[PDB]
Design a protein around this ligand. Sequence first.
Ligand SMILES: Cc1cc2nc3c(=O)[nH]c(=O)nc-3n(C[C@H](O)[C@H](O)[C@H](O)COP(=O)(O)OP(=O)(O)OC[C@H]3O[C@@H](n4cnc5c(N)ncnc54)[C@H](O)[C@@H]3O)c2cc1C
Ligand SMILES: Cc1cc2nc3c(=O)[nH]c(=O)nc-3n(C[C@H](O)[C@H](O)[C@H](O)COP(=O)(O)OP(=O)(O)OC[C@H]3O[C@@H](n4cnc5c(N)ncnc54)[C@H](O)[C@@H]3O)c2cc1C
Lengths: 394, 394
Amino acid sequence: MKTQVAIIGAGPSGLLLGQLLHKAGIDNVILERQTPDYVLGRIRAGVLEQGMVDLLREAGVDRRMARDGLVHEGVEIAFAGQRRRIDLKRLSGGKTVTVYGQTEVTRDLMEAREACGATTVYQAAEVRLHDLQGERPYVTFERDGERLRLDCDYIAGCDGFHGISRQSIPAERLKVFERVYPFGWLGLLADTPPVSHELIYANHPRGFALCSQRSATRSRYFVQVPLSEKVEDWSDERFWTELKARLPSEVAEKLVTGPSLEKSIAPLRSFVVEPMQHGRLFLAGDAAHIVPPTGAKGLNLAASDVSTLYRLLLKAYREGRGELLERYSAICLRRIWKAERFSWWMTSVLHRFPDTDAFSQRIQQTELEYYLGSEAGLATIAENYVGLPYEEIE
Amino acid sequence: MKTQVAIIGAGPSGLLLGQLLHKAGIDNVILERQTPDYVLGRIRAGVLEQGMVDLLREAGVDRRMARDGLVHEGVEIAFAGQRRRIDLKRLSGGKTVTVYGQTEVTRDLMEAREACGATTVYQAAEVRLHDLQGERPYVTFERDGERLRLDCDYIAGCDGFHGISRQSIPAERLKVFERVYPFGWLGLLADTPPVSHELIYANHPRGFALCSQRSATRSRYFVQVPLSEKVEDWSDERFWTELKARLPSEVAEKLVTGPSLEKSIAPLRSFVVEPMQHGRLFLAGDAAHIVPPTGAKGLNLAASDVSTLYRLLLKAYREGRGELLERYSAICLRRIWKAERFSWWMTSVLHRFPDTDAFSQRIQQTELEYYLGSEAGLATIAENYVGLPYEEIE
Ligand SMILES: Cc1cc2nc3c(=O)[nH]c(=O)nc-3n(C[C@H](O)[C@H](O)[C@H](O)COP(=O)(O)OP(=O)(O)OC[C@H]3O[C@@H](n4cnc5c(N)ncnc54)[C@H](O)[C@@H]3O)c2cc1C
Ligand SMILES: Cc1cc2nc3c(=O)[nH]c(=O)nc-3n(C[C@H](O)[C@H](O)[C@H](O)COP(=O)(O)OP(=O)(O)OC[C@H]3O[C@@H](n4cnc5c(N)ncnc54)[C@H](O)[C@@H]3O)c2cc1C
């Protein structure tokens, strides 16, 4: 086979880049290791920046999101009994965030790609990338036992943290920056109405807790948990009791509980590689970077990498300006590092870190008191939470 | 002897509290371990908040400060080649800071106390504090071999970090919060004109550097130095070469160097005790807390503790409301912890910390890029730098 852009991975990154590119007339073939059902089983993210919302609109995949997505105008941070509201809309100059599940975004995109007849190969086994520095790079994969070859101009590695694309770059051309946190989040999806119309992040002596949602009758809750915890040690009931013990009484009292639809533990990590490209191969999303979920930036960074790779490729094809693609990593890294810094700070102030001395505990408490009580402090969280502006270029 | 308020220490804290109290009609006796000359030899601080300026005016000790003090409207932070200016006046809503040396403030105050005839006992040896919980606490000291007793109503411990007043509180009534940094500052006073009309804080791969001043022909420079450094290993010339190597070229080029009037190394520390009182004894300034010098908050916290202890005592005597003095530590601690947080952050972003991994280095660089390029980021530094409002009470 032959295509113009080969996309490895059919998660949100690959599908968005795929849709945008197709609508613009740049053929693209997506290769995905799992089946469609497997991909749709992943719960994941729930908070979308205005920027990602506008990108779904541009791919023309926003009908259901505009219908069912919920626009949030603020978030609440609870600490030491207090519950402070950050008016995102007011403090950001009118921007807001949208709650629409990643599973749903992935669904909308997959449906859109089918309807337009673009190519997607599922169960593409053993994908290998070749001649990344040549003028004619290519991908080989196995489909029902036989090895096939796809020739393309460029390759977009949208295959997540464990994807083959980042491992295909000679290790010596890359610089890795990583911090592993000593805790993870234990998450629970329940078919129950949410405890608040906005999200609640809670710093409690017992450990972090987060009250989120997917819609008016679907909730998502998280508790900080030690790295040794196994999910089978957490019955629905043990979870509910722990969530309640970490929330302020007036909130824990209104909480409608119920059996879990899904329960899973996800460790926290910060990861960035520089550069994010090598020859004809460009990494986007989780393939190039990981942020802890505290700032809801994962799916949002993937969107910005994609919006960026797309606009550069658009220039490369429609305008013949292929030299602009060298600017990908620089553009992307500026936004990435700021979101990494925001996620890191958020994680630092909301979580209970082990073996922490008295001074640092007081500093953490004072960080919250200052930032949540200063108009300038609130504006720094707010502008970062809704999402900093996407870069332009030319 | 007998007095109403016994003040231990004749540094800035003791003298300010002493002057304010005298002018209001509350007699006070100051006890100081060293001689006046010894006290006046200490170089120390140079940056005063508006709040401390107004306090010097209230003690009526501002003639020379208004004359010779310099009002700074901004500071500059240099990192990665760039030189960013934080317009303090604009971003703080019109507040500024004043550069007038601590030695000079101490001088002005000492002169004022002499002229008014208030009591100050120098070379007061072996000061001991007694009956702190009684109704009649007292201080004993040795003056030329003989032991004397001073009876008072209250005792203000303004004796610095190594003073006797904090050690007089039963250790079990106090909670200490401390962080020791793995570096100190090597400072140099030179009779040369300053390299800028405003201060310059510099983060350089080689370590922190600060360009400060005392007047139009007197400069003060600092370099971060390892905890093992001995001042005798730093000749004037070695210092100048190191300062230059840490500043941006256009600044290092304008630098007028010269022999040092004074050279000394001061380690960095964060220290807070809670509470700041015990019975009839109240701690103020360095006796109760230490901040690293990066945020210029030391002398400024001492001033606010003093402004607070004074207004409470004023109520106690002139209005009979002595129950208000129990509110001292709470009022003081609110302002103290925020300044501790600001000093800690400042130190964290401007200094080169040993054994630092790649991720943290990038986060530090990104902290600066974000805060110095966001209007909300700049406002958080600015409002904190000029000084957060003093609390009111009643
Ligand atoms: C398990 C996990 C849980 C998360 N939970 C949350 C959460 O609760 N909240 C939140 O805010 N953020 C969360 N995130 C972050 C957010 O969901 C991600 O940043 C986002 O999915 C990024 O999308 P992506 O398309 O770049 O990669 P992914 O969504 O991971 O998709 C990449 C795709 O590439 C495929 N692939 C992998 N290897 C190959 C191969 N060799 N060949 C072909 N295809 C391959 C994968 O099967 C997958 O379909 C989570 C991330 C992970 C990994
Ligand atoms: C050595 C050092 C260097 C500093 N350098 C800087 C600098 O470069 N820049 C900056 O911003 N900040 C600096 N600071 C911070 C700032 O100068 C202080 O926070 C400030 O001096 C606080 O004033 P104070 O009156 O509370 O205590 P101090 O000024 O320390 O004065 C307390 C006084 O109490 C006296 N005393 C001690 N023990 C007894 C006793 N047993 N009986 C009676 N009297 C006693 C002392 O002799 C001293 O006179 C420095 C602090 C120190 C200690």
